[model samples]
Target chain A: DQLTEEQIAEFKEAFSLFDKDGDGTITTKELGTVMRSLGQNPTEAELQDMINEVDADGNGTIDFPEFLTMMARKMKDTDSEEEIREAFRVFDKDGNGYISAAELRHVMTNLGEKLTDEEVDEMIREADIDGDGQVNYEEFVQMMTA
Target chain B: LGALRRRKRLLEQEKSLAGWALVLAGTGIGLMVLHAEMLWFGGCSWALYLFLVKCTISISTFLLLCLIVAFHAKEVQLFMTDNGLRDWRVALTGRQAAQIVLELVVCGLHPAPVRPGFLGQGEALLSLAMLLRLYLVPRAVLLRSGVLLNASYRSIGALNQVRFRHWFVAKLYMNTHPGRLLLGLTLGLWLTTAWVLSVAERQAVNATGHLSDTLWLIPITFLTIGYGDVVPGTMWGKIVCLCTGVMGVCCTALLVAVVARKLEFNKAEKHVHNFMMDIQYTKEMKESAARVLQEAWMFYKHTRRKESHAARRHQRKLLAAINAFRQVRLKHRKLREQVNSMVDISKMHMILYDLQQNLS
Candidate 1:
């Protein structure tokens, strides 16, 4: 499902928090910053795996829309509705409606299971239902149920 | 090429060693059965003494093979673990030692024989339990898997994309076509078991005269639809029947799940369904927009003519219509958004492009 306008706005605000360079994309280096702050140190291999899983466009980074798509896809694999909601809250990081690419990278790599950037991108493609790249609560719930 | 050959040779040795382990375990169990059967012979009999010696020989040989496996543990571990051993002691834990003792007892030791009825039952149970040695099948598969032979996988890449090795390739095939895997496993089990049961039951009362009849007994027992026309008179045959029934139920459930998954629509079908829903949603959205506008115009005109009781009543109706129109319009908009979310054109295009490339 396409994200509601409110959700898109929330996601954009969240994305701004991480897009420190104001380039509207989260690079692998930016994600590394978030990881270090969380006291989770990621190796070069882990970073490469993260990018390979999430960078949908093969642009070496993640945009806001792609970020949302990845979160929605991750949210789908959760067990209960409550767990799904909790997952969304984690992805939103700062309780914003949308998830930023940095938030995605942090949440995905934090579990200690290293993933490739391609896998993250593949997940984004699955949940980015509206083709606009961003996932809102509606898209997330729909993907979860689907 | 030399590396590939070396890997192949190592893998072949690994496969043979695993196979030998299972064979040795089976032979030990067989000797134990013979020892149990020898209980009918009184003490001081040379035949009984000879059987005891043979049983000890089999168990000793099997234990020797176990030691060989342990000695070569580093090489086998290297095949699975990319890096060398994290801790050497990790290979020999108290738990592992206990497990080996337990396996030795289960597969090698023969309990003292009792009366004929109990004796037959005990031997059958032990024999069936020894089948656990068949884990060698997977062990052999792992030894031959591509993870240990990267050179071979790379060289054979053009023929098949099995970069991981034989075990992974087998897993992929099983996952991709579970129905075929289940069918194959079931048939293999059924045939091998039928043959074994037939050989065991040949001298038993009510044994089938024909080999085909004995085979047919397998399916009947497996399906749990015993006609009672031909039944297993021996303990081994009864044990085989029990295993068949259990396996049958498991395979039936798996078959049902595979069929259900196969019945689900693929990506292209889902896209087409979403498109149709989107068209329907568009039409509803237009109708909602027209209703809202019409209701708003009536409500405006009625308000301008307000002053009488009838005019007030008409104004109330117009107000209600406007509210209903607003609700429907909101619902229509939400449905339109849902329909929009259902379609992912970019992914579809990517899939089509890949297919096109593959075809070319």
Candidate 2:
């Protein structure tokens, strides 16, 4: 919903950069060349399949919207650091970067269940690397996410 | 990476098989539902239902043949090479042949009240029993589950890369829109259960003089808010109600969990909240620091210029202010430490590495 015009323009600009010959369309051959330039190699068939998916006109080339859509899909699939950081903030109560024992204790408990101090401390011990007695964003994120 | 690729390939294979199976199963269920209609309208509607059922069976059979070909192409090639047989038809095993034969027999014998005597009842029962084909929903769910896929990929250590676990998928589904999932499941169950109850309690329903009341009885019993207005007289109806009660309880728990998850703040909202709180904490800390300084200066001036009661009182106030300042400073330090911990250099490097791979 928040993909603004500038974001779309940025996507278009990236596609243009990869267009190489300024042909106004990115063919399967050009896509392969751009991918190779970026140090990734794709087989001819795989590259063709990629183009076929986004080539709306079926002329064997990707236009701006098609390229943008493909790029958007790829971007959506990868988990960014910013997303993880935002999650960390949820448990990082008291406006602290680290999830303190108190915060963990509160967050872990829900409805009729409550975590003891010992349990919270144990959780911290598992993820608190520098021994500061608190679960920092990095340790906590690695612990929770794959 | 090799393990990841193998797991991915396996998932694609399994997904293809599962999709075909689901399609066949869905066709079977559709045929059975139409059979039910055939049973209800046993006169002129019979020909249309029979035609439709035949079409479904033919289509499903063709699809199953394709599925078998896709699934056993390698095996069929190996078997043919080993054997003296030249016919590709021999590629299908006896069990598969029998399955096809049985399905054909079931499809052909659509005995509504048309077939005379013993054959008619047997055909009707057999046609009604075809509803058992609906078991494919659970079968598809299991076959497509991450647990099975993950276990197969376990030796390759690709389990972590892909989630095939049923629970994980269910949780993800529930988390996305629990209310929708719950509503869909409940409605599906309610309708299915109502149909079953309608069949089982036909005599009781007739006695009660209304079939809709029996349908209404199901939800009231399911919700466990038994109004006692319309009760199930038949044992089968009672059993159905019991199952409904149990499912209702489980669904209620799921409903609670979904609502709680929905109520929780998302990532961006949490970040905004944290930033706002951080600002507030900083403001309070600054105010506390200023108060401490002002009180200290007042105490120093009173001590140097006079030994009056007012000066003594001022000294006490300064001590109190100093204590408050210490507490506030400790709180400020903790907040600062938290803010600093958010940026881990090593973690940042890891994130960058991952991003680089994806970007490239």
Candidate 3:
């Protein structure tokens, strides 16, 4: 599929950090950490949902190239650059720190989107690296990069 | 996880519904067979009685099976649809296996930490009202820890302590009150139904001319053991007999399964395997673990090499490396006091102490 330049840039930026082990694909665990770094903290539920959507196979982790391909699909569905930026921002709320369920909900509500509580909760579970209730800045940054 | 969960729920519902449907269909077929046999044998009281008995089992089994299906439909629908499964099992038209892979996978996950089916909140109230009919009161043993049981048990010799603990923990179990109530209700229903059948069977035997020999059948039928001796001799009593037979089997099975799951003493091996699956081993966590393991391996090597005094200094260096690995683990665990405090990893300290002894 053809992508807009903005979408391409988004992928470039997001993929840059997660290309860890210098491998082209991101594993589910790696993606989870990546999301935590990126500000939109995902719960295990959200992570799995993302993985399932992206990784058709039932294997727990995502290969790096597969992740990029998956992101391309997500980017295609995303309507605007503002939405894309906000998706990252929503996950990484507080500006100083990581994204969480409450933060994600707030973003969705402010944007007039319909983010379900279950969805938000799932995201937090997937993304929270420390297993604490909240995600941190490094986790947020890593997630987006992944 | 969501898809997996949904898939599991759907399959469970389908499985339950399919099982019920099978029973109902089989019962109907059985009744027809019994009636046909009656035609061959002649409509004697005993033969007519057998026909009616078969009919009762078919009807009641169908009814209760439907009840179970209705109770779990929502859960089934959510899980079994296109989102989780391509379509319902009933809709499948291929070389499909009876047990769905997704369903088995979910079961393997053991999603519910505790038994899923239990009594409802108002179950105890309903049960209490119904229990009067069965004069059998339910009794549960309160297994208090013994002196040894107490010593080994976390709260040993704490019968009084248990009472207070229960009171203190009551708030936490408020959510489970409904489950307890449901269990009570199910047990009450079972006893009431068993008693009714038992009493009715006894009365029927007394009414018959062959009182002494046939009277034994009442207890036999009530206990779910269907011996072909001293059976019902009337159409209606035969129907009652069939109902009692199926009910007895089902009630016994459900009770056994529920109790086994509740007691946590079933065939399930909840050991290191559980710990392995459940322990969240992130890449960093795994790396750290490997490092600790590596240190231990190195220590073993160092000890092996320290057979002579010449290699003693190298052994000391190896011991120091292991101690450093311990320090690294503690450093990572610095954020949580609970993690550090919970485990008594005195082996590292003991090793250090041993090293000191060796030096001396």
Candidate 4:
């Protein structure tokens, strides 16, 4: 059950890279890449919300040390992150690891005819990481990194 | 206090690296000295005897100096502040150190406190530990026991030195880690499997000339590849192996759970921390934002209401009003987007709920 030394070393390496600026703060910027890899398709608002929340100093940018401190604090305190992650997973019911604006429209269909193109765009604006209008890993991770 | 804190940090870092370095260097040098001392000088001339003796003494002296350096690095007490002397160097005192640092930085003057204690007992315990480590190096098991005893004593002493709050916080942080538990369980399983397999082999040998049939079995027998060519011939051997195989799967499942739980925690913890940290700003900001958002929702709702009724009277008029409301929403959304954009959209859906609440 012990993690191989290699695996632990790899994790440490990733942690170091994620902690850019070496002030030991891992701002949301560091995690932006990992999230993109997981395909969370986070919006700018989601990314900004993450920065404003976890950056501790109320700074616009997060540092690595603050990132670790926040993560540790959340892991210790919050019970609902698990539930929210699961709920988000369900919303991506297609299990494609992404929730595109088009698919997000289906959820609103039952309430009304459907979301307009602008409404869908707004939803992506809320969740998508890149302004390019598609959710990438950094956006998804930033959204979920909570 | 500032200097002491910086010193403590530096010492801690150096100790982490040089602590092991000292132990290794001391052991190596001590071994060479011991070897030289043990050499048969029976047939040697007086010069040879002196040569070997000096070499042994020189190595020992050099090692002793290295040990002292390691000591200073680990515990930074200079001269009269030395524990052995019990002089209690005033400069080393926490308050005095704090004062001197402040004076130097503020007034730029040299402070007058530097002297070594004749017999520093402050490092007496550490010296004893190092001595024991050096002495036991030739005996591998004793060396291990020595190292373990030193570590255990320090860990327990540190725990005892702290208050209950500190202890509670330490335990709380430590408990969140599950890797050690998984490792312990895995080791236990491995030992049990080895014991069972060995016992089966021994039983087979005593029962008949044949070694246990299971003696030739694959390292892991649970996969149903029993080979059957050599398995537990004795009834007891068969029963034991059977139970071991069945329990192996359970162990595997537990291992899987442990691994998955570690990954799951990593993914989820970062999310909640981010959300909570962001939402934890001043209540005034939150209230203002909430009020603005609520007002916008109300305006949209009212616009929809008046427009819906107008559609019954004149579709063109209703469409025009709807377009007006849409234009207002676009402008508002853009402004809101510029300021704060990422709200829980599901919560936004509650604005319509708010309208229903108002209507009722």
lDDT tens digits, residues B69-107, model 4?
444434445333233344444425556556435422322
Best by TM-score: 2
Candidate 3 lDDT: 0.47
RMSD of each predicted structure: 22.1, 22.0, 31.0, 28.3
**What is the RMSD of candidate 2?**
22.0
Indicate the worst ten consecutive residues by lDDT in candidate 2 chain A.
A70-79
lDDT for B292 (candidate 4): 53
Off by over 4 Å in 1: A1-146, B1-91, B102-130, B148-173, B199-211, B233-239, B273-341, B344-360
Q: Evaluate residue B119 in candidate 3 and report its C-alpha lDDT on the 0 to 100 scale.
A: 25
How accurate locally, in lDDT, is each candidate?
Answer: 0.61, 0.63, 0.47, 0.49
- Can you rank all candidates by lDDT, best first? 2, 1, 4, 3
State the lDDT at A5 in candidate 4.
Answer: 78
lDDT tens per residue, model 1, A63-102? 8668765543321111255567666866776465665555
Off by over 4 Å in 2: A1-146, B1-85, B105-111, B114-130, B133-181, B202-209, B224-230, B249-276, B299-320, B345-360
Comparison by TM-score, 2 against 3, better one: 2
Where is the poorest 10-residue window by lDDT in model 4 chain B? B109-118
What's the i-RMS of each model?
23.7, 18.6, 21.4, 8.2
Question: Any residue pairs clashing in model 2, and if so which?
Answer: A97-B338, A97-B339, B146-B164, B146-B165
Q: What is the TM-score of chain B in candidate 3?
A: 0.22
